[PDB]
């Protein structure tokens, strides 16, 4: 005695988890914003009441899409630049010993070599100041990348400074944002909203320290796909940024050598004045209190009476074993030994100085056979940044001892994007539905 | 109490509301379904959105529900698909839970609607012949 019939509803607010191709939006640079949709002056956020949604930062396809897009943009930006195939020659290298400090012993090589000119039948004897990491002895040396692939010089007019990028979904798709503070990136989120696209995310490439990122608005946040598994990287998000001041104080001189028709190689001519190591400074008290916050948050996961130890990176490439980043065109690799060196037991104005080594031959992503040569930057360089998080790895894990050791980690830049896209997911709207009603056609 | 008329909750604001309330904002969701590394991240996505919208429109049209957002049909509600009474459906449950519940019987219902529409068209043609 029901006499119910199917009734079709179009426009139903129902969605399903989906993977799609988000497009860029933003307000010469490597991150090509000239092909991005203009961002709306007043973006609209629809706050969904009574909606609880299942989020998982560690399986978000947005991270993979961003990784692919960043790699593609980096490759596109380097296509029209000069390929330094002629640079693979025998180098007559001597030690740069004029006005050098005891920490720059043999770090710079004054290398003379023959080079091609615009005329195919002429050669020019030139010289350049290379870094000890960029050359390998065959007094005879060759560039490190010569036995793997030819390096592409970066176009000098293109800037490496990150620009914020928004990832807006196509029609028929929505971006759900988890507004729940204290959210650890997985599980039900009861405070959900719909956004045309996320906040401006800057593609900051950094290892062992998340830089110029977002800050937790409540307290330090510890996130891990499986915290009990030591093989999973722990993402730490700060609430108070730690100011870091990184400088190369050498007054570098850039000279240009015509290596062919319309092709210029930018060499380091001479350092004007004293030569001393590039470095970084981190406030000691701020770092100590930030580490205390991190320890008190980690105690929730690893017990209240455990010993929390911070030590050096285990080993590997220079990219992962050191805080690797870019500061105004020059690529720093900083020995973060004064930061993660302490023990914590449950119970002024100086700063920690991290020495840094500069590199010109760069392998940004974990790709063998695709290298980039950074032209030297004219003059002293300084940059101030916010440390907003960490990429830690827990050492060991046996139950014999009550001590937990965390070491800096990185290498894979997907984690860097994951720290910014943790509170976002993509869904596809299913507007069609069928319901029972007494109505009959 | 006192009221001043309806309000606008946004694109998917009625997602958490009941089916009776959510059915009053169908057009809001309906009208938002159509609208060199970044430039090619747009063309194929726009094509995909167009194909999805056209698939939905064709699926509605082959049932006789063309150009309608709420459409009654001649297919009886087989109780095996769902045993819930209307009182606990339209006033104490949202559309997301409904989609979770009835995910198994979608295609058979769609085919039933298709064949019912074909029968209706044939019957109308026969009737107008007299």
């Amino acid at each position: 005695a029901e006499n119910l019939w199917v009734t079709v509803y179009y426009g139903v607010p129902v969605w399903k988890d989906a993977e799609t191709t988000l497009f860029c939006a933003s307000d010469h640079n490597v991150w090509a914003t000239h092909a991005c949709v203009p961002t709306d002056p007043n973006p609209q956020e629809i706050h969904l009441e009574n909606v609880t949604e299942e989020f998982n930062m560690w399986k978000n396809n947005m991270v993979e899409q961003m990784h692919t897009d960043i790699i593609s943009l980096w490759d596109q930006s380097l296509k029209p630049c000069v390929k330094l195939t002629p640079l693979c020659v025998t180098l007559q290298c001597t030690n740069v010993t004029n006005n050098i400090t005891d920490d720059m012993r043999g770090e710079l090589k004054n290398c003379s070599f023959n080079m091609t000119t615009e005329l195919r039948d002429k050669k020019q004897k030139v010289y350049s100041l290379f870094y000890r990491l960029d050359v390998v002895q065959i007094k005879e040396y060759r560039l490190i990348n010569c036995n793997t692939s030819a390096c592409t010089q970066a176009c000098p007019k293109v800037s490496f400074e990150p620009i914020p990028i928004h990832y807006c979904a196509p029609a028929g798709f929505a971006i759900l944002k988890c507004k729940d503070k204290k959210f650890n990136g997985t599980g039900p989120c009861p405070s959900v909203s719909t956004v045309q696209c996320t906040h401006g995310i800057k593609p900051v490439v950094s290892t062992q320290l998340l830089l110029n990122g977002s800050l937790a608005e409540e307290e330090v946040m510890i996130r891990s796909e499986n915290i009990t598994n030591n093989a999973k990287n722990i993402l730490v998000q700060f609430n108070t940024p730690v100011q870091i001041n990184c400088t190369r104080p050498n007054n570098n001189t850039r000279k240009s050598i015509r290596i062919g028709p319309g092709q210029a190689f930018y060499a380091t001519g001479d350092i004007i004045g004293d030569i001393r190591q590039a470095h970084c400074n981190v406030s000691k008290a701020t770092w100590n209190e930030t580490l205390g916050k991190v320890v008190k948050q980690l105690r929730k996961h690893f017990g209240n009476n455990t010993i929390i130890r911070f030590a050096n990176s285990s080993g590997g490439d220079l990219e992962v074993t050191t805080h690797s980043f870019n500061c105004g065109g020059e690529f720093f690799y900083c020995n973060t030994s004064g930061l993660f060196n302490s023990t914590w037991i449950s119970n002024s104005n100086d700063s920690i100085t991290l020495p840094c080594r500069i590199k010109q031959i760069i392998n940004m992503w974990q790709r063998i056979g695709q290298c980039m040569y950074a032209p030297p930057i004219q003059g002293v360089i300084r940059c101030v940044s916010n440390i907003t998080g960490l990429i830690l790895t827990r050492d060991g894990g046996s139950t014999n001892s009550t001590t937990e050791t965390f070491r800096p980690g990185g290498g894979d830049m997907r984690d860097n994007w994951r720290s910014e896209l943790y509170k976002y997911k993509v869904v596809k709207i299913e507007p069609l539905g069928v319901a029972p009603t007494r109505c009959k056609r | 109490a006192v009221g001043i008329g309806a309000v606008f909750l946004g694109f998917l604001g009625a997602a958490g509301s009941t089916m009776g309330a959510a059915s009053m904002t169908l057009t809001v969701q309906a009208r938002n379904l159509l609208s060199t590394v970044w430039g090619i991240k747009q063309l194929q996505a726009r094509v995909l959105a167009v194909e999805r919208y056209l698939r939905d429109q064709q699926l509605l049209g082959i049932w006789g529900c063309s150009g309608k957002l709420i459409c009654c049909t001649n297919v009886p509600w087989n109780s095996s698909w769902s045993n819930r009474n209307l009182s606990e459906i339209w006033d104490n449950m949202t559309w997301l839970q409904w989609d979770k519940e009835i995910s198994n019987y979608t295609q058979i219902i769609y085919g039933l609607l298709e064949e019912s529409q074909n029968q209706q068209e044939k019957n109308e043609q026969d009737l107008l012949a007299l």
Partner: antibody
Framework: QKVLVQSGAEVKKPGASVKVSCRAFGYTFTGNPLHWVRQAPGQGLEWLGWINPHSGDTFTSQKFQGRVYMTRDKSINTAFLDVTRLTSDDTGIYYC???????????????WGQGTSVTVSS | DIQLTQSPSFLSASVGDKVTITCRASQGVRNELAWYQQKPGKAPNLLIYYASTLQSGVPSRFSATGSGTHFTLTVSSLQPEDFATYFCQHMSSYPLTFGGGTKVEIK
């Protein structure tokens, strides 16, 4: 997350006009109506009226018609109350409050602004 | 207008005791009632809507019952931060009017 923020305190001479702003955060501005209420120093709350941000319709108390006006701008998610012909009896804290508005009718004011203090004296 | 009267205007009680405050309406309102709490020199906060439903985040010790003209707000167990001005407000017809104001004081 639901928050309402108003402008600063106002001091005016009698007979002037005062504009009290109210911007919303954490919820859809057009999705709920906004009550305007006032509390005098040491007195109770007096209900001035309420506005619908979506349709723009307004209602004012019968003992306030022709004196107080209400408007909204959805581009910045703000509601404005304009009180004219100020007097010494108009002193107090003006509050803008979001109504729960379940079922398209008044249910209760749950989110309140910080309160704008308006003073009137010679 | 519609008159809302409250009893008691003032009340002295100890922590842990029970408080019952009555709102009486001259005209009949079925469930069109809201109970609020306002602290000295601070914005008011909602306690009850529909005269029987707690606002989200309100402690469960609060409760209210009543239909028509007689309504009661009950604090089952007094708490130190529960001392404030209690208001009852109707919304059946314009204008909306608030109660006189009930103040609970420690003993």
């Amino acid at each position: 997350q639901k928050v309402l923020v108003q402008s600063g305190a106002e001091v005016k001479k009698p007979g002037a006009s005062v504009k009290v702003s109210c911007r919303a955060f954490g919820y859809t501005f057009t999705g709920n109506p906004l009550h305007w209420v006032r509390q005098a120093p040491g007195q109770g709350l007096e209900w001035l009226g309420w506005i619908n941000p979506h349709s723009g319709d307004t209602f004012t108390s019968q003992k306030f018609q022709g004196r107080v006006y209400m408007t909204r701008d959805k581009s910045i998610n703000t509601a404005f109350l304009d009180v004219t012909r100020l007097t010494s009896d108009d002193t107090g804290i003006y509050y803008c409050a979001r109504d729960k508005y379940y079922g398209n009718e008044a249910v209760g004011m749950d989110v309140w602004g910080q309160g704008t203090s308006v003073t009137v004296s010679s | 207008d519609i008159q809302l009267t409250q009893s008691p205007s003032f009340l002295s009680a100890s922590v842990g005791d029970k408080v019952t405050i009555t709102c009486r309406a001259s005209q009949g309102v079925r469930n069109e009632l809201a109970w609020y709490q306002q602290k000295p020199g601070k914005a008011p906060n909602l306690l009850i809507y529909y005269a029987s439903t707690l606002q989200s985040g309100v402690p469960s010790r609060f409760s209210a019952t009543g239909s028509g003209t007689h309504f009661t707000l009950t604090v089952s167990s007094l708490q130190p931060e529960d001392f404030a001005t209690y208001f009852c407000q109707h919304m059946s017809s314009y204008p909306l009017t608030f109660g006189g104001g009930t103040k609970v004081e420690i003993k």
